[PDB]
Amino acid sequence: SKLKPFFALVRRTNPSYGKLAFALALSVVTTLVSLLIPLLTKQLVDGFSMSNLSGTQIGLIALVFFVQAGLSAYATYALNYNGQKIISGLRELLWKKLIKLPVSYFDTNASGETVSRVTNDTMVVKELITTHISGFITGIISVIGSLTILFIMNWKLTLLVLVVVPLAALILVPIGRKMFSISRETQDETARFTGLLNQILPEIRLVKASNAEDVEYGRGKMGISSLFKLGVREAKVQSLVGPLISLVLMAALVAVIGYGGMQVSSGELTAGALVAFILYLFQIIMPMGQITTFFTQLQKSIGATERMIEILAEEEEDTVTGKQIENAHLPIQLDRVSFGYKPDQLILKEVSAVIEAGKVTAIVGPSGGGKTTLFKLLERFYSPTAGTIRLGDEPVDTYSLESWREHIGYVSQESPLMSGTIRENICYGLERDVTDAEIEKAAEMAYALNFIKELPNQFDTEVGERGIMLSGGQRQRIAIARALLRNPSILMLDAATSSLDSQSEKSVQQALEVLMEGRTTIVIAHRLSTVVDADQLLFVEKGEITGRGTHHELMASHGLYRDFAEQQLKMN
Amino acid sequence: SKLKPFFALVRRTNPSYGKLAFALALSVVTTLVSLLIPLLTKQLVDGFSMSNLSGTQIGLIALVFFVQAGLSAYATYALNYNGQKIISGLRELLWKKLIKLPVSYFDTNASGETVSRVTNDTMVVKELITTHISGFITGIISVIGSLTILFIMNWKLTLLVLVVVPLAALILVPIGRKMFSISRETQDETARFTGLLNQILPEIRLVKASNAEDVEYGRGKMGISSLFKLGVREAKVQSLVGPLISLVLMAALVAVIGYGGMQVSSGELTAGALVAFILYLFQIIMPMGQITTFFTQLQKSIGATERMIEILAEEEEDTVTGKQIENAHLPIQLDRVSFGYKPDQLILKEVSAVIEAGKVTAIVGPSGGGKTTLFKLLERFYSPTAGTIRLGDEPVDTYSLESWREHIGYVSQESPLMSGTIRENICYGLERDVTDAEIEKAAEMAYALNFIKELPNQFDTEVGERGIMLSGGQRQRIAIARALLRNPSILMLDAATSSLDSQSEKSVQQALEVLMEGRTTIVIAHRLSTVVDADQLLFVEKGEITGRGTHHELMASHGLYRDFAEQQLKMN
Ligand SMILES: CCNc1cc2oc3c/c(=[NH+]\CC)c(C)cc-3c(-c3ccccc3C(=O)OCC)c2cc1C
């Protein structure tokens, strides 16, 4: 029942059965031919006794090794290679989700967990497929075949004295559990001691201040003493643990192998059957670890499959929206948008705003306010619940999010560089037209070409795998350039010039505002220095808009102290 | 040669040889009796042929197990418990050093490294002593005895074909190295892939904004496919590693054990000799892993001893030196004092300041310019290569200045809550609590108890481990009270945080200013609150110190063009 989702997930990558079935059958044949080795060995002993049959068999035996290896080789590869083909394409699908699926909010839950999914659960499924399931089948067949060979081989006598040994050795596991618990409490006490010293030593200043060492050291004398006491206990426990694993195992060997002594002394004709029995003893000892590891790993594998099937669900609606792109220079309206992230949690409520075409709009409010949510709903990253975004004849619901977001240029305060060469950011967003080498003039109108004219190579200027060898205030110029050179329709900025120290601020403004002041702008602001240039300001508080109009008129009308106090406190 | 420091370090805790020698002898006897076991197992097998004498001797084996384990217990216990007696004592010594030894600058180098040195490194030494050296001796004795027994037991025939097996199996180790290298490069490429996705996924806002998923997805296709390619390679390598092991070992078995078959078919009287040999086989395979682990761990253990002896070196000798501290109220003069960290990097240079019996003395300056070092220089955390400090030249530094430390009223950001209660802080002050019967009403006089009157118990009130549940100002006031209640002759203060500015600072200021109306103080807290609380200033720049009088004349002379910068920066 629970394996049906896993089988379906494997079926998602269909190139599986045709060679996987052959690989599994090949491994079964490998196990079967492996079970015939000790039978050949048991005939070889009698041949060596006399001589010539021994030479001939020593040969044949060699053969039944190499094929047993050789075939097995072509077995595991035919599995293992296919295992990668099972994983790779699977990752493919997951990637085809984890970039197409995530509407921004879905990716705001946990980026680290999501990235760890497609790098750990894939490995877990690979281990389950390539080794663990084949190991399970191989171990099951090997164990049952060895048992049946020992039944038909003897009079269920040596087999009986063998199978009795695990029954008595079952008592060994509780000793192991006791040792594990004692050891674990030992490291627990060690961690407590380490915490005590990591609390005392960093505060050595106060200890030295009042010559208190005579008592502080005293505490340490307690600490180690506790450890010592605990140590004594484990030693005593180890005194009863150490020999016991050594003891019973001795008996176990003497219980079984020496038992075969009868069979080779006077009981039966077991001279070579004894070496065959020892070979089968190794044959059965080998796969127990594999079988128990598979039985343990099955739960982790099914959990990984559950996370995969959870992630694979749902899909974005870029094409589902439609295709109604046009001049897209109409004024924007917000009407009674009332939602945050949940229907019950109303971060925003009953908001209406007007933004005229070609008019600069800025947003001011507290950090805990709805400024960020307002910005993300303007960029349509959040699906509206009840409020309406208004353009000519209500086209936003069918305004081709691909094309609508194409018309939008974006820039943020963080300005994080996408790692790689500078050519990545140079050509990013220029899809459907490489435009040849006109990028240089687009850069120079943005005042970035002259700045970057330090010019190591213009394409080998790699920001690095971590993207760290560039100033934080540097990416603003290239971001403005890339926004302007393809999408000069509407731009959105999020406090990208707060910390440029009024020197890079002027440098980036004399490009941006000079080149694109004729287009619609939406701005999230942190300072009054950038809102004076804005024709319209919107003040957010308590999840509601309470400020409309020009900076001075709104400031005198309703902004007043409600904004002076906050802005000066930020200044202070 | 290199083991001489380790032997000396063990000798530092002398309760060692008397029982360790007996434990080693008992372990050797255990090895001998274990080696004797398989010889007994042969006669019992000729006896299993005989029947009666076999039952009687099958007995004796039981005894020679219960002794073999039994004595071994009293061996390992005597080796283990007594072993702890070293480590505990060793830690003892370390603690007796790690509090007496460290002058403040010695502790400034590292804190977590030292607790690692005193816990994990002691654990390594314990693992060397209690098990690894006994493991080495046991393995050597067992291997030599097994070889000698097989020599005197099988004349150059079975032993030779046995020892040939490791010679051929030596080729396995290069295969293991190849597999390990391939696997390691596999996780390296996996880590590279994880880094790529950790670069990309957090940037999903920008990725979606420019609707470039179509190309970004391509990058993912470049990633997994590479892994797939690499995976294919390792699979091929795995195809040539898996069976080969299962070949080379298995042939080995039939190379030797099947060989023993001839010895029991027509060779000679090997019926019980075969089972004795197969049992010696495990008896010799066991200690190989132990001897290898000991050889690997010897280097780590000798490094452990090196770190131990490095830590134990040198000791702070101010404890006994010095005498005749009676008044602690004569004028103090600093003159010609210059020291940083090394004779070529003097942070401080030829400075002189006078405090006399004045009310206060405040140090002002840029961060790192000398404010932080003078605070500890006055109260002797560092011993400078500097001029004399005229307190009579502290009687030419002949005061018992370790005992003079019972004059500090150290103030800081604090939160140095050692142990876990307020009564723990009381116990911390047990230096001279012979009059502890009357100190709590002094705390009432110290104005603290009224604030502490919100007491849950006040006799066992837990401050929480690491002290993360108390207000900062609460620790401020309680520390001030605990300092002043006995030894208020000298006050140390250094404040760098102003989170709870108004209430906490005003309360502590009024309380202290009431509570040292007749004592000299040293304070470095802030620009202007400090001076309106203290009314005297000193200023340090580039090491050099200057100041004479109250704030106003210092500003008129020195602060006219320098201190306004600090005022504006702190106002920001
Ligand atoms: C005092 C002299 N002999 C000491 C002798 C010992 O003899 C052993 C022989 C063995 N071979 C014959 C079947 C095996 C497998 C384990 C043995 C143990 C042993 C017991 C418990 C855990 C580990 C071992 C151990 O060393 O690990 C082996 C997996 C053992 C242990 C000690 C301390």
Ligand SMILES: CCNc1cc2oc3c/c(=[NH+]\CC)c(C)cc-3c(-c3ccccc3C(=O)OCC)c2cc1C
């Ligand atoms: C392709 C089918 N799956 C496998 C089948 C295997 O057959 C093995 C059979 C013996 N067989 C008796 C004929 C031994 C000793 C190891 C075997 C190994 C083996 C090889 C290298 C290292 C460890 C083992 C292993 O499991 O550890 C034991 C040393 C092994 C491993 C796998 C994955």
